[PDB]
Design an enzyme around this catalytic site. Structure first.
Site, PDB file in Angstrom:
ATOM      1  N   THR E   1       0.828  -1.198   0.000  1.00 17.42           N
ATOM      2  CA  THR E   1       0.000   0.000   0.000  1.00 17.42           C
ATOM      3  C   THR E   1       0.867   1.254   0.000  1.00 17.42           C
ATOM      4  O   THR E   1       1.841   1.342   0.742  1.00 17.42           O
ATOM      5  CB  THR E   1      -0.944   0.029   1.221  1.00 17.42           C
ATOM      6  N   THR E   2       0.520   2.222  -0.844  1.00 17.38           N
ATOM      7  CA  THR E   2       1.165   3.530  -0.841  1.00 17.38           C
ATOM      8  C   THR E   2       0.086   4.599  -0.797  1.00 17.38           C
ATOM      9  O   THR E   2      -0.705   4.722  -1.737  1.00 17.38           O
ATOM     10  CB  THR E   2       2.060   3.724  -2.068  1.00 17.38           C
ATOM     11  N   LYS E  33      -8.900   2.780  -1.717  1.00 20.35           N
ATOM     12  CA  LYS E  33      -8.360   3.006  -0.386  1.00 20.35           C
ATOM     13  C   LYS E  33      -8.630   4.405   0.146  1.00 20.35           C
ATOM     14  O   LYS E  33      -8.407   4.649   1.335  1.00 20.35           O
ATOM     15  CB  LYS E  33      -6.852   2.737  -0.382  1.00 20.35           C
ATOM     16  N   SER E 111       3.473   0.235   2.763  1.00 20.44           N
ATOM     17  CA  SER E 111       4.709  -0.445   2.391  1.00 20.44           C
ATOM     18  C   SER E 111       5.578   0.424   1.490  1.00 20.44           C
ATOM     19  O   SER E 111       6.806   0.413   1.618  1.00 20.44           O
ATOM     20  CB  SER E 111       4.384  -1.775   1.712  1.00 20.44           C
ATOM     21  N   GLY E 150       4.280  -4.447  -2.524  1.00 14.47           N
ATOM     22  CA  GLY E 150       2.948  -4.344  -1.964  1.00 14.47           C
ATOM     23  C   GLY E 150       2.062  -3.297  -2.601  1.00 14.47           C
ATOM     24  O   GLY E 150       0.873  -3.243  -2.279  1.00 14.47           O
TER      25      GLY E 150
END
Lengths: 229, 221, 230, 200, 202, 237, 227, 242, 248
Positions: E1-2, E33, E111, E150
């Site tokens: 995830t960013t 998200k 991540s 990720g």
């Protein structure tokens, strides 16, 4: 027969115990008026201290609910102090839960909802007080919100409470820095009530942008002198 | 919680709510129980007969309960009795005796006459059956006050005084009805002062008589 | 209109249920308390329902250093004496301290008051005379249902207790200086309670005496033990 | 890990005006196969639900969702829709956040008003437009679905695609197999087909 | 995830990648998200959002006032403390950017946080415009997409400007579209063996 | 205390009666008439509504589904009934969750009547002012027609009416009911009884709620058009 | 109405005074304590000939050496007896010794005033008879008011007013057990409305050797003949 | 018929049970409080109902924490109930914070408690009026709290049967001494006022009890006036009668 | 709280007196009306001010319950205020947390009426002294208008009025309502009906009017989500009401 002793409906659809709590708001025989300036809200309350044994600095019907909100109460001081303590707890709790100061109108609705419960639950009697909240809201500006024993509240351009609230009210209707706004309200209360005030006969609260505060007897005398000039 | 004392003593020493609960019983329909040597016979005098419950209810395999008074109140007592009978089996390994079940039911009724916030049951029950592995018939009665007692023959409901008067002269405790026929015929005669008959026999042999059998008894009388 | 509950004031400011609980003591048998500097004495006139019956216990012992006598509802006295025993027991457990008589009276003061301001309960229908000995000496306390607890040299509660109380006031300067002669202080108590009798005389079965003092643990005299004092 | 105790897989696919949901039939107790008739796909009205994971949880959830969708129909006077049912599943699962059921639910259906095929995976809703997989062979199912799937398959073609994906993933999973059932769901009809597969 | 959050001269922008993973397996390739708490308060995480948003809406109806980012922050903070997010928005008091609590002119979580922070530290400047902020927030997400296993798939962007409506740019960038497969794997009909067939009465 | 204001709802009269229950039954006697008729092939539930601007096509105020096989006709306070109907729906779904079988009609009626009785014996609260007619099917007894009242008594019936003019309606039902009628004959009997017991001058489709349970069992709560259709062919029109 | 825990202007609880008049309507119970034991006798008062009088248990066992009679609302007695039996059993569990009779009477009387908004006081009076090494044969009269006295001879119930006067004349410290049996039967025969016999009256005794024993209809009949 | 319950408003808006609780206060013994220039003096008339009372042992004035003195008239058990709450309230303030509770803060806590006893019919209003005060970081404070829960600060306070005469003498004290009375001299006037107020209750003998809390004399802690100072005030009061 | 018994009980005539007295309070309240058209619902009421110095803008007699559901009342304003707070809360906790969407109008109305019935049977509480007109739209039932009574009874209406002039207003609505009405026609009828009931000045400051109509994406506060429609509830401003009154 017991519809008059607890808050249930009468055959006419009235709550007599609520109506009798309104009668209890005028026992103190104190008149108050609230006026909004373009920047400040001012509450003037009569300060009657007949007993010479009283410490006058303790006789007060104006409460500082929070940094910005002030409350003036018309009614017995034990019920006035009950509402003041509850309002202070509500104001502090709102700041904790939501991260910013409670607006004056939200607190007025908050306390009106409490009065509504006493109006509907039999084991709670109504508080025999009328609560006038004043502040300068960071969104709505100067604000006056008045709550009654019935759980009813509304915002006001200006308002007066007390036995002679009518005489002050029509006087404000005809007309319709904070020192000038204070000087206006004191003068209009003198004209409405037909009684000159000494520095010991008045309670003054001023809601400004950053804080609500009450004037001392020296500050009130300063305003009385300005009206004399 | 509501805990108003509804059952309290009057100045004359009476608990009016218990007295009025008995009046509810006396307006109930009927429960005539005639205990014999080997029989305990229970009887009562656009409705759908299939699904309308019979007044006699099995508390367990060996104990049955008839009642008089408020039908809705009786369901609660019967439910508590059935749960208790199962719990006694579950924890004491034994089915309840007729006296133990009667003591529990009368205990619940007594509890409601001195608990705050409740009114007494308007129910009197005739509890009949046999103790486990036993054979002498039992016929107990409970009342709203909680009083329980054993009877050779007893009636509750409307016309109870008339039927009890009839029983007090036709039943003789010197020589109880020796034959199941005598148990039913005496019960039918009392109810003849529509008839339902239930015969309780040892070893959980509880049967309700058919209408054909009852008609023969009625025709004979 | 105002006597049906302890939660109601009369228009003159009176509490009628509390006053009616006070009337319960006046219906009870007289018990007399008096003390000198060294000893405190309880004298009680036990009452029997029938001449085939025994005489009801009037004096209760809390511990070696304190005991009480009752007038009025006996079940109320047991409830209060049980609470008093719990308080004295708590002091010994948590502090290894004998509970002071004055402090014990205030604990009874607070317990009795709760039944006069809250709905649902009733005032205790019993009056108590608590005698005790502690570091400050002999103590005599009068407990009332209203919650009032008073420290006195001598006192009498129950039926016709005024005759005993009047005698104690007249004899006050004498028995407070009796000091270390416990039998003479018991004697003065017996004369006081004899001033409250109307028809019956003090008998071996009637009279009950308790005493506590400097080197005297709380002891109760009943039966032939009081024959020397009659 | 209670999800691997019983095994089993569920796959859902969208086609042209149709959805397909498929599952294996093996009920296992670790390596031991107990039942070959444990269907993991249930329907409540026109909304189909496949549940993988612990079998007792599968039975418990089906009873719970039959409970909730029945009360929904009585209260709402209408059958629940696949999008509403997906929210119902999501909130039901997070209602046990720290007491979770060890399940993977798959929603398949066609919205009765819009007529658009709907599938969803999971509490966090994966409302995919192509395919949803669940179970012990999800990695095998991802490989087969990602290679075989193409958009807008007709119901006959969709059946072959979801069948071949299911059969070949089950062949490579130790705890999946012992038969398979495929539901080809359209607005007008729902066809149930049992697949022939290896019985080892 | 960013996830990144960048404040610019008249608002705040939050961006995220759309990849969801279950271990090394990509479960959802287009997970959203950026979660809306209120119309102008948006949240992103590396259920609590749907409950905080519910109470924020109820609180806003009760007070008849616009929701404040401090209120959402306080509610999330108190709720999470009872048992890692970026909360951004515009309220009558201006634009705000929080992480759960630290404020920031730019933020990054997940991540790919370090890869995103590298781009932010390199290119962030005071007094960004809206277009530059979107460009910066997008490049930070793209860095996480290329460099963090990720993170992947698309970039979702939400822009909250002080005087304007929030604009949610779902799939603002789609830099990972699959190429056409070499062959079509459509089976001929009848390939699968069927043991039994039945119509289901729904 | 509050003792002075307590009405003492759960107490006996000197005659052994319960005032609040008898007063609650008096309340229902002014409610709209609901009729249940159990035919050989099903049950018929018919209820008379009790204005031009009322949205009649949407109003469902007297007939409720509790199950796939059980329906209730309501006489009395509709707000009190909605509380009981919700519990019955939950109880029926609780039974299906436990045993994987549809709840028997009598078990559901008994549980609902036990809730009514509980408000009559303890708690200090007033009774529910509701009378129900339960029309249900189960594999044990088939078609069953029960009724329950605020006291918590429930009885099984072949034909029963609740609400206003129960005495008149039951007299008509006694005269014209046969054990071997069909649902269509049972339907016809329902409207004639309602027509001859209504307080209004005429019986029209907008004043009626109609429901049937027929054999698998099928519940049909009639639409206003279907009530209009059945009204004309019955002859009331 | 008035609260259940209200005092009267004379200092007496209303419900307790009303409950005491319920006892006056109960069946007569008579107890005599001697140096050899305590004899308890009750009037059965069967309401119907069909009523099985052998099922009327108006004398019950509390402990092996403690028994009691009841008069008044005997349904309230069973709750009081069950508490008494539990207290006697709990004493043996906690102290490895039999409870004292006076202590047992205290445990029962602790329930007497534990009512108010228990809805009402008990409407039953007990004659508690027991033996122990500390005080010998003892007889107590427990009331719903919470008060109890030790009695040499006591009669409660409907005929108590006349029976107690007769017990006054007849009791002396030198009575033997068999005299007490005859005395109890004599007074019961005097006050019972029915003609006394073994089916409408019951006798019981507490002795150190035999404990609490209830006399059978056979044994009572022989004792009845002796009159 | 509006006077049978506590929380009932009469049609005029009055609480008659609170007014009836005040009638109990007016029946009690006279207690006074005088605020001096640096402290507070409390005096109370203790009626000697019988010669058998132990002298100087039935103490009426109560201390709260170490700096607050409380005296009350009316139902003494109600006053003890109020002081017990005040001691719990003074302690809880000293746990959450560390300073001894301020007198105005303490006055509000007692006022809320007394006002809460007028809110329900299940509770009875307090049958006392409490004169309380002490020395805190802001100086000396004197309060009188009524059964309604109302309380104000006072220069001098009086309740009980002889409250009217005591108020007349306290007013003279305030008039004659605008400079502020001294703690020692205020003790003497407290004796004088109580003795003067006793003429309204002359039918029985009385015992005088005085306590004070002065920044200089008692180091800001509440102490009873005993020994030479007590006797000196009694002689001053006895002399001032003539 | 010692009040655990019902304050609302049956009378010997079968009446529930506290409910009848609560209905009397509603009849003494200010008149509020609702009209359902083909493409919307309009709810309108008079804003009666206690004082000329009161800011009636602060007192909203029409409340949004959900984006597609609004409510108006006649009777005790404080009772309505706390009912609205409970109704909004129940619309979230009981429905939207579970199904991810706002409830249909009839389900919210049944939940509001459940709160009202509880005040009728629970111990120590009087009934609410308000009747509510609840107007809403849901995807499957379209537009609906419900009246909820203090007893907890609710009914669907094509058009109805409650309050002081409900009898006269309902007669006027019977003449004017038809099944082909458009929302603008319904608003016009609503203003005419409210005109005959208002005593003093009749303008945008003395009248509160709201509609359930088309979705308003401009009131959504955000863009970029195609399936998020926008509130259908819309309170008309004083300027808007004045415009429709000038061209009346």
């Amino acid at each position: 027969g017991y519809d008059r002793h607890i808050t249930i409906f009468s055959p006419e659809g009235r709550l007599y115990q609520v109506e009798y709590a309104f009668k209890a708001t005028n026992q103190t025989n104190i008149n108050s008026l609230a006026v909004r300036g373009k920047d400040c809200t001012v509450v003037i309350s009569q300060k009657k201290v007949p007993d010479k044994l009283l410490d006058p600095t303790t006789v007060s019907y104006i409460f500082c609910i929070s940094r910005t909100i002030g409350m003036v109460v018309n009614g017995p001081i034990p019920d006035a102090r009950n509402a003041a303590l509850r309002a202070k707890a509500e104001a502090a709790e709102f700041r904790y839960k939501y991260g910013y100061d409670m607006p004056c109108d939200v607190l007025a609705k908050r306390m009106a909802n409490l009065s509504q419960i006493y109006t509907q639950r039999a084991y709670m009697r109504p508080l025999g007080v009328i609560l006038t909240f004043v502040s300068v809201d960071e969104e709505l500006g100067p604000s006056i919100y008045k709550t009654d024993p019935a759980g009813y509240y509304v915002g006001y351009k200006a308002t007066a409470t007390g036995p002679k609230q009518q005489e002050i009210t029509t006087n404000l209707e005809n007309h319709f820095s904070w020192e000038k706004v204070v000087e206006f309200a004191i003068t209009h209360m003198i004209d409405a009530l037909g009684t000159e005030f000494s520095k010991n006969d008045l309670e003054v609260g001023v809601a400004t942008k950053d804080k609500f505060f009450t004037l001392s007897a020296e500050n009130i005398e300063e305003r009385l002198v300005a009206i004399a000039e | 919680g509501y805990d108003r004392a509804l059952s309290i003593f009057s100045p004359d020493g009476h608990i009016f709510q218990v007295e009025y609960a008995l009046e509810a019983v006396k307006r109930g329909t009927c429960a005539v129980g005639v205990k014999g040597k080997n029989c305990v016979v229970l009887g009562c005098e656009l409705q759908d007969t299939r699904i309308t419950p019979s007044k006699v209810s099995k508390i367990d395999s060996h104990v049955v309960l008839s009642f008089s008074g408020l039908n809705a109140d009786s369901r609660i007592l019967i439910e508590k009795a059935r749960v208790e009978a199962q719990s006694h089996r579950l924890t004491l390994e034994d089915p309840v005796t007729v006296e133990y079940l009667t003591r529990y039911v009368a205990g619940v009724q007594q509890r409601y006459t001195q608990s705050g916030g409740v009114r007494p049951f308007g129910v009197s029950t005739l509890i009949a059956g046999f103790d486990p592995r036993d054979d002498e018939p039992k016929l107990y009665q409970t009342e709203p006050s909680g009083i329980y007692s054993s009877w050779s023959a007893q009636t509750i409901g409307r016309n109870s005084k008339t039927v009890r008067e009839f029983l007090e002269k036709n039943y003789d405790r010197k020589e109880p009805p020796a034959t199941v026929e005598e148990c039913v015929k005496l019960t039918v005669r009392s109810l003849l002062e529509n008839i339902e008959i239930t015969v309780v026999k040892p070893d959980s042999d509880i049967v309700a008589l058919s209408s054909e059998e009852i008609n023969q008894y009625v025709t004979q009388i | 209109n105002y006597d049906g509950d302890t939660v109601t004031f009369s228009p003159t400011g009176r509490l009628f249920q509390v006053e009616y609980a006070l009337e319960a003591i006046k219906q009870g048998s007289v018990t007399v308390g008096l003390r000198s500097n060294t000893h405190a004495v309880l004298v009680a006139l036990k009452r029997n329902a029938d001449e085939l019956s025994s005489y009801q216990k009037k004096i209760i012992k809390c511990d070696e250093h304190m005991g009480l006598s009752l007038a009025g509802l006996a079940p109320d006295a047991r409830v209060l004496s049980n609470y008093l025993r719990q308080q004295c027991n708590y002091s010994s457990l948590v502090f290894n301290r004998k509970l002071a008589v004055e402090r014990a009276g205030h604990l009874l003061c607070d317990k009795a008051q709760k039944n006069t301001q809250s709905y649902g309960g009733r005032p205790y229908g019993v009056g108590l005379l608590i005698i005790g000995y502690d570091k400050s000496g002999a103590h005599l306390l009068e407990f009332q249902p209203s919650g009032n607890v008073t420290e006195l040299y001598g006192t009498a509660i129950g039926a016709r207790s005024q005759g005993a109380k009047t005698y104690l006031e007249r004899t006050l300067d004498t028995f407070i200086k009796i000091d270390g002669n416990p039998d003479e202080l018991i004697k003065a108590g017996v004369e006081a309670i004899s001033q409250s009798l109307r028809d019956e005389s003090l008998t071996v079965d009637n009279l009950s005496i308790a005493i506590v003092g400097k080197d005297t643990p709380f002891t109760i005299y009943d039966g032939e033990a009081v024959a020397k004092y009659i | 890990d209670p999800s691997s105790i019983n095994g089993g897989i569920v796959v859902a696919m969208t086609g042209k005006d149709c959805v397909a949901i498929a599952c294996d039939l093996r009920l296992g107790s670790q390596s031991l196969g107990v039942s070959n008739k444990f269907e993991k796909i249930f329907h409540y009205g026109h909304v189909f639900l496949g549940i993988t994971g612990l079998a007792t949880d599968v039975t418990t959830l089906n009873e719970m969702f039959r409970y909730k969708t029945n009360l929904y129909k009585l209260k709402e006077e209408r059958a629940i829709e696949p999008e509403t049912f997906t929210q119902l599943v999501s909130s039901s699962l997070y209602e046990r956040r720290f007491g979770p059921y060890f399940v993977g639910p798959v929603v398949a259906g066609i919205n009765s008003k819009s007529g658009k095929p709907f599938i969803a995976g999971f509490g966090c809703i994966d409302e995919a437009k192509d395919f949803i997989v669940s179970g012990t062979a999800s990695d095998q199912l991802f490989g087969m679905c990602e290679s075989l799937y193409e958009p807008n398959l007709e119901p006959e073609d969709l059946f072959e695609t979801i069948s071949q994906a299911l059969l070949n993933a089950a062949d490579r999973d130790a705890l999946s197999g012992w038969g398979a059932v495929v539901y080809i769901i359209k607005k007008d009809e729902v066809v149930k087909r049992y697949l022939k597969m290896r019985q080892d | 995830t960013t996830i990144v959050g960048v404040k610019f001269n008249n608002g705040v922008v939050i961006a995220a990648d759309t990849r969801s993973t279950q271990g090394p397996i990509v479960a959802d390739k287009n997970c959203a998200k950026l979660h809306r708490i209120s119309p102008k308060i948006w949240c992103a995480g590396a259920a609590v959002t749907q409950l905080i948003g519910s109470n924020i809406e109820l609180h806003s109806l009760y007070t008849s006032r616009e929701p404040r980012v401090v209120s959402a922050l306080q509610m999330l903070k108190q709720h999470l403390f009872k048992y890692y997010l970026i909360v951004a928005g515009v309220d009558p008091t201006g634009s705000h950017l929080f992480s759960i609590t630290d404020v920031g002119y730019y933020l990054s979580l997940g991540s790919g946080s370090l890869a995103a922070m590298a781009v932010l530290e390199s290119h962030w400047k005071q007094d960004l415009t809206k277009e530059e902020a979107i460009k910066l927030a997008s490049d930070a997400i793209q860095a996480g997409i290329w460099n963090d296993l990720g993170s992947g798939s698309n970039v979702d962007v939400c822009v909250m400007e002080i005087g304007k409506d929030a604009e949610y740019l779902r799939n603002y960038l789609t830099p990972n579209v699959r190429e056409e497969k070499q062959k079509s794997y459509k089976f001929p009909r009848g390939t699968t063996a069927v043991l039994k067939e039945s119509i289901v009465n729904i | 205390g509050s003792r002075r204001y307590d009405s003492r709802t759960t107490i006996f009269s000197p005659e052994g009666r319960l005032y609040q229950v008898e007063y609650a039954l008096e309340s229902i006697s002014h409610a709209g008439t609901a009729i249940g008729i159990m035919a050989s092939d099903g049950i018929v539930l018919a209820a008379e509504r009790k204005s031009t601007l009322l949205e009649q096509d949407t109003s469902t105020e007297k007939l409720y589904k509790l199950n796939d096989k059980i329906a209730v006709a309501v006489a009395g306070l509709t707000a009190d009934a909605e509380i009981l109907i919700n519990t019955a729906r939950i109880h029926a779904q609780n039974y299906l969750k436990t045993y994987n079988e549809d709840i028997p009609v009598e078990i559901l009626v008994r549980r609902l009547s036990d809730i009514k009785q509980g408000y009559t014996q303890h708690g200090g609260l007033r009774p529910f002012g509701v009378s129900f007619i339960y029309a249900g099917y189960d594999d044990r007894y088939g078609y069953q027609l029960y009724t329950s009242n605020p006291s918590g008594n429930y009885t099984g019936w072949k034909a029963i009416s609740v609400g206003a003019n129960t005495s008149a309606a039951q007299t008509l039902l006694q005269m014209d009911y046969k054990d071997d009628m069909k649902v269509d004959d049972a339907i016809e009997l329902a409207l004639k009884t309602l027509s001859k017991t209504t307080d209004s001058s005429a019986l029209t489709y907008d004043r009626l709620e109609f429901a049937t349970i027929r054999k698998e069992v099928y519940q049909k709560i009639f639409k206003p058009q279907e009530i209009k259709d059945i009204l004309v062919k019955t002859g009331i029109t | 109405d008035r609260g259940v825990s209200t005092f009267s202007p004379e200092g007496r609880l209303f419900q307790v005074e009303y409950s005491l008049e319920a006892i006056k309507l109960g069946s007569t119970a008579i107890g005599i304590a001697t140096k050899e034991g305590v004899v308890l006798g009750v009037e059965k008062r069967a309401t119907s000939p069909l009523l099985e009088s052998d099922s009327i248990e108006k004398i019950v066992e509390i402990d092996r050496h403690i028994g009691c009679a009841m008069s008044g609302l005997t349904a309230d007695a069973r709750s009081m007896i069950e508490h008494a039996r539990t207290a006697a059993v709990t004493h043996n569990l906690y102290y490895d010794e039999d409870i004292n009779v006076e202590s047992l009477t205290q445990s029962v009387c602790d329930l007497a005033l534990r009512f108010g908004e228990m809805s009402r006081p008990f409407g039953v009076a007990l004659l508690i008879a027991g033996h122990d090494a500390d005080d010998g044969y003892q007889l107590f009269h427990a009331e719903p008011s919470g008060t109890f006295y030790r009695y040499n001879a006591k009669a409660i119930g409907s005929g108590s007013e006349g029976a107690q006067a007769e017990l006054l004349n007849e009791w002396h410290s030198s009575l033997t057990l068999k005299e007490a049996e005859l005395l109890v039967l004599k007074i019961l025969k005097q006050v019972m409305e029915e003609k006394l016999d073994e089916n409408n009256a019951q006798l019981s005794c507490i002795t150190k050797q035999d404990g609490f024993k209830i006399y059978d209809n056979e044994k009572t009949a022989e004792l009845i003949k002796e009159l | 018929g509006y006077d049978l319950s506590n929380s009932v408003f009469s049609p005029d808006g009055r609480n008659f049970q609170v007014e009836y609780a005040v009638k109990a206060v007016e029946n009690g013994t006279t207690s006074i409080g005088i605020k001096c220039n640096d402290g507070v003096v409390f005096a109370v008339e203790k009626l000697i109902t019988s010669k058998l009372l132990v002298p100087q042992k039935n103490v009426k004035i109560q201390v709260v924490d170490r700096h607050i003195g409380c005296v009350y008239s009316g139902l003494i058990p109600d006053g003890r109930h109020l002081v017990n709450r005040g001691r719990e309230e003074a302690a809880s303030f000293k746990k959450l914070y560390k300073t001894p509770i301020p007198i105005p803060a303490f006055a509000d806590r007692l006022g809320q408690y007394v006002q809460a006893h007028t809110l329900y019919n299940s509770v009875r209003p307090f049958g006392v009026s409490t004169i309380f005060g002490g020395v805190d970081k802001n100086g000396a404070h004197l309060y009188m709290l009524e059964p309604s829960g109302s309380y104000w600060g006072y220069k001098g306070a009086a309740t009980g049967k002889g409250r009217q005469s005591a108020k007349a003498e306290l007013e003279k004290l305030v008039d004659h001494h605008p400079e502020g009375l001294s703690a020692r001299e205020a003790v003497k006037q407290a004796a004088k006022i109580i003795y003067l107020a006793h003429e309204d209750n002359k039918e029985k003998d009385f015992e005088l009890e005085i306590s004070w809390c002065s920044l200089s004399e008692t180091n800001g802690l509440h102490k009873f006036v005993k020994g030479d100072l007590l006797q000196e005030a009694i002689d001053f009061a006895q002399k001032e009668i003539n | 709280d010692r009040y655990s018994f019902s304050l609302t009980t049956f009378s010997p005539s079968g009446k529930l007196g506290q409910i009848d007295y609560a209905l009397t309070a509603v009849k003494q309240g200010v008149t509020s009306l609702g009209i359902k058209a083909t493409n919307g619902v309009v709810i309108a009421t008079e804003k009666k001010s206690s004082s000329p110095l009161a800011m009636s803008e602060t007192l909203s007699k029409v409340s949004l319950l959900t984006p597609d559901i609004g409510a108006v009342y006649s009777g005790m304003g404080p009772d309505y205020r706390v009912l609205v707070d409970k109704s909004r809360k129940v619309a979230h906790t009981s429905y939207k947390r579970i199904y991810g969407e706002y409830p249909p109008t009839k389900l919210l109305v049944s939940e509001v009426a459940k709160i009202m019935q509880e005040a009728t049977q629970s111990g120590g509480v009087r009934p609410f002294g308000v009747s509510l007109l609840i107007a809403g739209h849901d995807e499957f039932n379209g537009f609906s208008l419900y009246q909820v009574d203090p007893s907890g009874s609710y009914f669907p209406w094509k058009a109805t009025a409650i309050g002081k002039g409900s009898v006269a207003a309902k007669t006027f609505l019977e003449k004017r309502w038809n099944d082909e009405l458009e929302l603008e026609d319904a608003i016009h009828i609503a203003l005419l009906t409210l005109k005959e009931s208002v005593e003093g000045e009749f303008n945008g400051d003395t009248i509160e009017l709201a509609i359930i109509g088309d979705e308003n994406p401009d009131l959504l506060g955000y863009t970029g989500i195609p399936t998020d429609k926008g509130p259908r509830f819309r309170k008309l401003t004083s300027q808007e009401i004045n415009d429709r009154l000038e061209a009346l």
